[PDB]
Amino acid sequence: PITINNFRYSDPVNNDTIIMMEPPYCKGLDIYYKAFKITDRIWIVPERYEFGTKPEDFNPPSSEYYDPNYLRTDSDKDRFLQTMVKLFNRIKNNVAGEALLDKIINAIPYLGNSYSLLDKFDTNSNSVSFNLLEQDPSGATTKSAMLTNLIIFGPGPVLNENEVRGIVLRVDNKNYFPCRDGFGSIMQMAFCPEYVPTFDNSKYFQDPALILMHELIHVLHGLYGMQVSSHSAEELFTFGGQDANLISIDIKNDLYEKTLNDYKAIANKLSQVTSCNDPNIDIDSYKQIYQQKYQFDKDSNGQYIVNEDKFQILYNSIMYGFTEVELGKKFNIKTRLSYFSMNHDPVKIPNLLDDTIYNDTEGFNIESKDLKSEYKGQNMRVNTNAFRNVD
Numbered sequence: 001p002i003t004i005n006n007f008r009y010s011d012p013v014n015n016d017t018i019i020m021m022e023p024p025y026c027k028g029l030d031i032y033y034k035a036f037k038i039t040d041r042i043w044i045v046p047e048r049y050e051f052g053t054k055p056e057d058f059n060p061p062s063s064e065y066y067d068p069n070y071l072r073t074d075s076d077k078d079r080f081l082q083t084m085v086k087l088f089n090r091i092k093n094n095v096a097g098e099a100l101l102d103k104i105i106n107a108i109p110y111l112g113n114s115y116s117l118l119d120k121f122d123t124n125s126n127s128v129s130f131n132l133l134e135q136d137p138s139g140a141t142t143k144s145a146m147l148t149n150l151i152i153f154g155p156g157p158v159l160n161e162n163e164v165r166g167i168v169l170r171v172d173n174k175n176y177f178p179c180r181d182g183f184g185s186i187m188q189m190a191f192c193p194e195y196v197p198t199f200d201n202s203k204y205f206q207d208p209a210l211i212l213m214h215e216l217i218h219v220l221h222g223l224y225g226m227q228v229s230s231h232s233a234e235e236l237f238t239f240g241g242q243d244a245n246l247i248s249i250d251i252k253n254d255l256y257e258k259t260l261n262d263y264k265a266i267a268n269k270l271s272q273v274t275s276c277n278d279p280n281i282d283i284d285s286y287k288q289i290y291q292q293k294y295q296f297d298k299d300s301n302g303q304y305i306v307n308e309d310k311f312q313i314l315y316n317s318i319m320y321g322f323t324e325v326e327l328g329k330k331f332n333i334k335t336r337l338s339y340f341s342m343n344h345d346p347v348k349i350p351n352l353l354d355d356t357i358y359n360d361t362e363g364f365n366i367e368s369k370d371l372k373s374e375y376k377g378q379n380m381r382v383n384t385n386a387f388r389n390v391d
Contacts, residue, residue, distance in 0.1 A: 002101055004039050004088045009046065009078030015134050022131035023151065024167050024186055025051040032133055036081060041105050041149035044084050046077035049156040049163075049190035057157045063343050064158045065195065065390055071154040080154055083193045083352050090209040090360040096330035097213060100322055104216055107223035107293060108149060110183035110266065111276070111286060115171050118269055121286060123147060123278040127167040127178050127185040145278075150219050152189040160195035160346040162211065164188070164218035166227055182225035182262030182294075189215055193352060195390075198344040199336045203380040205347050205387055207333040207363045214238060214324045224293075224318050225266075226259055239339045240323020260311060267296050267304045332365055334375035347380075347387040357386050 005017055013019055013034070020032035023045065035045045048058075048071055058068040071080060091097035109128050111121035123129055129145045136142055156163070166179030167186050178185045196206040217238045221227050228234035233251065236243045247255075270290055276283055290296075295314045296304040328335035352358045359366060364377035364386055371377030380387065 002039060002092060002098060002105070004085060004092055005037060006085060007036055007081065009034075009074060009081050013133075013135065020133045021045060021151075023051070023153075024126040024130050024188070027126040027131065035132075035151075038084065038088050038152075039101065039105065041108065041147075043148060043151045044081060045151060045153050046071065046080045047154055048072075049153040049188075053156065063160075063346075065160050065346060066157060067159060070159060070192075079353070080193070084152065084191075086352060086358075086360050087193055087209050087212050090363060091213055091216075093361050094331050096327060097209075100213060100216055100220070100327070103317075103322075104149065104220050104223060107184065107220060108147070108289060109178070109185050109223060110225070110290060111281070112269065113169070113176075113178040113183045113185075114181055114265075115169075115176070119272040119274050121273055121276040121278075121281060121283065123276065123281060125167075125169060127169055130186070148186055149223055150187045150189065150216075152191050154190070155192040156190045159192050160197070162192060162215050163190045164215050164222065166222045177227060177229075179222035179225055179227045180229050182259065182266045184223040184225040187219040187222045189219065191215060194349050195346050196349060197346050198380065199341055200344075201337045201341070203344070204334050204375065204378045205349075205380060207331075207365075207378060208349065208352065209363060210324065210328055210331065210333045210335070213322075213327050217322045217324070220322065221318065225262060226315075226318055228255060231255075235339055237319050238323060239325065240320070241325040241338065243339050244320070244323070256315060259315060260306065263294055263296075263311060264306050266290075266294060267306050270294075270296070270304045271302075331363070332372070332375070333363060334378050345390065348390050349386065350388055 007018060011018055017037040019035055021035035022030065022032050033045050033047050035043045038044050060066045071077060092101060111123055111128060113127065116122045129147055131143055131145055134142050134144050165188055166177050169176045179187065193208045196208050196211055198205045221234065228237065231251065233247045236247055270287060273287065291304060295310040297307045299305050325335055358364050364383060365372045365375055366377055371383060376382045
C-alpha cells in the first residue's frame with residue numbers, strides 16, 4: 001500500500017525522509033536544500049526553481065503573475081510542504097489517482113542511457129541520482145548518492161505556470177533527454193498550489209490536485225522515456241479529451257514507431273548488462289524491474305525482446321490511460337473543454353489547509369456544504385470565500 005508521509009518543515013534531517021539534497025542541476029557544486037520524501041521515489045524541495053535563472057528574472061518586467069518573495073521563509077516553506085502533503089493525500093484517496101501514483105513510483109528511470117556503457121548499469125549520472133548529506137552514526141557528515149523518480153520544487157519566476165522537465169545531459173555538444181528516448185530520467189517539477197487557473201465554456205477555478213495530477217502525467221511520460229519532444233503534442237495527449245484527436249494519425253504513428261524502436265534498443269541493451277558501477281545494486285533484481293516496466297518478453301536464447309501487443313497496451317496506458325479530462329471525471333472536478341481556452345486571470349487559493357474550504361476526499365466540492373452538486377465548490381459565483389483575486 002502507498003503511504004504519503006507527514007513532516008514539519010523544521011523537523012530535523014534523518015537520512016531517510018528529510019535530508020539536505022544536492023539537486024541534480026547542482027551536481028558537484030555542493031549546494032544543498034532541505035528536502036522531503038512525500039512517498040517513495042518522490043521528493044519535495046520547498047524552494048523556488050532557480051536552475052538557469054537570474055535573480056532579476058524573478059520580478060514583473062517593465063496571464064503571468066510574479067512575486068519574488070513567495071517561498072523564502074521557514075513559514076512559507078512549511079505551508080507549501082503541508083499543502084503538497086494534502087494534495088498528495090487528495091490524489092491517493094481516489095482509486096484513479098492512486099493508480100497514477102503507483103505507476104509513477106514504479107516507472108523507475110533506466111540505469112543508463114543511449115551513451116552509457118552497454119553492459120553496465122550506470123547509477124552515476126545526474127539524470128538518475130542526486131547527492132545528499134548523510135549523518136554517520138560516528139558523528140561525521142558524509143556525502144552519498146540516491147536514485148529517485150521525481151523531485152518537486154516550488155515555482156520559477158512565473159508563479160502560476162508549472163513546468164515538468166527531465167534532466168538534460170550534455171553529450172557531444174548536444175542537448176540529450178533520456179526521458180525522450182525510452183530510458184527515462186529523474187523528472188523535476190516546478191509547482192505552485194496556490195495559484196490556479198479559471199475558465200468557462202458561469203465561471204470556475206481549477207482544483208489544484210487536478211493541476212498536480214496533470215503535471216504528474218507529464219512526469220509519467222518522462223519516466224517511461226516517452227516525453228513528446230518537439231510537436232505541443234505532449235500537452236494534447238496529457239489533456240486528453242477531443243484535443244488528443246488533433247494530433248494527426250500521421251504523427252501518432254511516427255511517435256509510436258519511434259518509441260517502439262527505442263524500446264527495442266533498450267531490450268537489446270538490457271540483454272548485455274552484466275555489472276553495475278554501484279555495489280548496492282542487485283543486477284538481477286533491476287533486470288526484472290525493467291522487464292516488468294518495459295513489458296519485455298524473454299526469447300528462447302535468454303535475450304529480451306519487445307512483444308508487439310504488450311508494447312501496444314503499455315503505450316496505450318501511458319499516452320491514453322491517464323488524462324486531465326478523465327481524472328477530472330473520476331474525481332468529480334470540473335474541467336475546461338479543450339486545452340485551447342483564453343487564460344482568464346488565475347486566482348489565489350489562500351487556504352487549501354482548512355477542511356471548510358478544501359478537504360482531501362472531496363476537494364472544494366464538499367457535500368456537507370452542498371457544494372458537490374454541479375461542482376458548486378469550484379463555481380466562482382457560489383463558492384466566493386474559497387478564492388481571492390490578484391494584483
